[PDB]
């Protein structure tokens, strides 16, 4: 780290009116009560009403930026139809340097922390001047908060129990 902090790239309030946002799960929990990760969001329909999205951001802060997102892989289809109302997955998280799309399916798995389902997590750095776009037909995890930073040099990582 030379600089590192947390800001609110897309505030949960007013980012996603047209998708119901507040849904969470019970493994991600706090003192025996359900939750989900602070920095991110789920999105789903407005009473089973999915429109598909295009959104973007580019830097004004003039510092480097660190961004995270995810891609939904349900363990069953009834969720997928019920939430998002497409068997089609097509997402496109795009930049100048980086760009990648996603089109997954159901893929059943064993219970792991009482979960079969999966969300594969995906991330990138994003510099000043460059723009990012998200496009999607659902099956997303979005940024609520994002990590502002400068670079650092020479510090690192330890494993230790002492």
């Amino acid at each position: 780290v030379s600089s590192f902090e947390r800001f609110e790239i897309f505030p949960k309030e007013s980012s996603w009116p047209n998708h119901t946002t507040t849904g969470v799960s019970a493994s991600c929990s706090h003192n025996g009560e359900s939750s989900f990760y602070k920095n991110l969001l789920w999105l789903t329909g407005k009473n089973g009403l999915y429109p598909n999205l295009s959104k973007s951001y580019a830097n004004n802060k003039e510092k480097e930026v660190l961004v995270l997102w995810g891609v939904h892989h349900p363990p069953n289809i009834g969720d997928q139809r019920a939430l998002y109302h497409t068997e089609n997955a097509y997402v496109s998280v795009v930049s100048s340097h980086y760009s990648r799309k996603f089109t997954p399916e159901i893929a059943k798995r064993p219970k792991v922390r009482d979960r079969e389902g999966r969300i594969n997590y995906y991330w990138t750095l994003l510099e000043p001047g460059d723009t990012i776009i998200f496009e999607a037909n659902g099956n997303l995890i979005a940024p609520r908060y994002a990590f502002a930073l400068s670079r650092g040099f020479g510090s690192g990582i330890i494993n230790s129990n002492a």
């Epitope: 507040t22 849904g23 969470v24 799960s25 019970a26 493994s27 009560e33 359900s34 939750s35 989900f36 789920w42 789903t44 329909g45 407005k46 009473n47 089973g48 009403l49 363990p75 009834g78 969720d79 019920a82 219970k111 009482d114 979960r115 079969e116 389902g117």
Partner: single-chain antibody
Framework: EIVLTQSPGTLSLSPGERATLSCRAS???????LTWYQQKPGQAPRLLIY???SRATGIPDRFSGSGSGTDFTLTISRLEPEDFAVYYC??????????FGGGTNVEIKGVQLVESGGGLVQPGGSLRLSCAAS????????MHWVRQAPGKGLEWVSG???????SYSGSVRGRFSISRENAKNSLYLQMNNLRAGDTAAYFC?????????????????????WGQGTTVTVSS
């Protein structure tokens, strides 16, 4: 959340007949948003229909509806004297507040919960209820406490998502207080400052699969299942 208005609160019709019922509100309100019930007095509610179209488990095909926005509608293909009953209209606010149509009698002319503690208190006093869970994962679902006077339109007292966003009514709030336990498989409702508006029957109610877990458990934005309720009264 918004005032509903059923249509009619009571009707009288003959065998071999349809029955149109229209529950409509102030504003236009998105249509996978309501669910539709029946009750035999003496019995708890039973679930029938949701989202203005679609049909619950263990069923005929006769109760069927339509409608959208401001006006939601449940129609009926055939009437029978076993259907003698009051049908209800329960909608999940976006202000996360259930609202209730006031029951609709059909007259025909010629796994489980368990509540705990219903009974008497003094008015202005203090008492608690609980519910306890049997045979599922009380982790997941969004829960609701509900009220019902005898042979009257319902009212919704309280509910809470599994993250902690409460919803009460502005009149009921503060005098009651909810609190939840998943490891213990039970729910709690400490209640104080109690007047004759509470002179009625109550229910503990299990609603919505939040987003995710393992199971053979899909979701609606209707209920899952109910409890047998219990009576509560202030009296001196």
């Amino acid at each position: 959340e918004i005032v509903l208005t059923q249509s009619p609160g009571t009707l009288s019709l003959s065998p071999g007949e349809r029955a149109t019922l229209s529950c409509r509100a102030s504003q236009s309100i998105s249509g996978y948003y309501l669910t539709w019930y029946q009750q035999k007095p003496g019995q708890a509610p039973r679930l029938l229909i949701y989202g203005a179209s679609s049909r619950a488990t263990g069923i005929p095909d006769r109760f069927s509806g339509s409608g959208s926005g401001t006006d939601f509608t449940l129609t009926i293909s055939r009437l029978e004297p076993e259907d003698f009953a009051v049908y209800y209209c329960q909608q999940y606010g976006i202000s996360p507040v259930i609202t209730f149509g006031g029951g609709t009698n059909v007259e025909i002319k010629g796994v489980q919960l368990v509540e705990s503690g219903g009974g008497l208190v003094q008015p202005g006093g203090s008492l608690r209820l609980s519910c306890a869970a049997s045979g599922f994962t009380f982790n997941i679902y969004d829960m609701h406490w509900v009220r019902q006077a005898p042979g009257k339109g319902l009212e919704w007292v309280s509910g809470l998502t599994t993250g902690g966003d409460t919803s009460y009514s502005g009149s009921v709030r503060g005098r009651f207080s909810i609190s939840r336990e998943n490891a213990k498989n039970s729910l709690y409702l400490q209640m104080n400052n109690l007047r004759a508006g509470d002179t009625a029957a109550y229910f503990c109610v299990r609603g919505v699969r939040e987003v995710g877990a393992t199971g053979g458990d899909p979701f609606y934005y209707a209920m899952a299942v109910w409890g047998q309720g219990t009576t509560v009264t202030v009296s001196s």
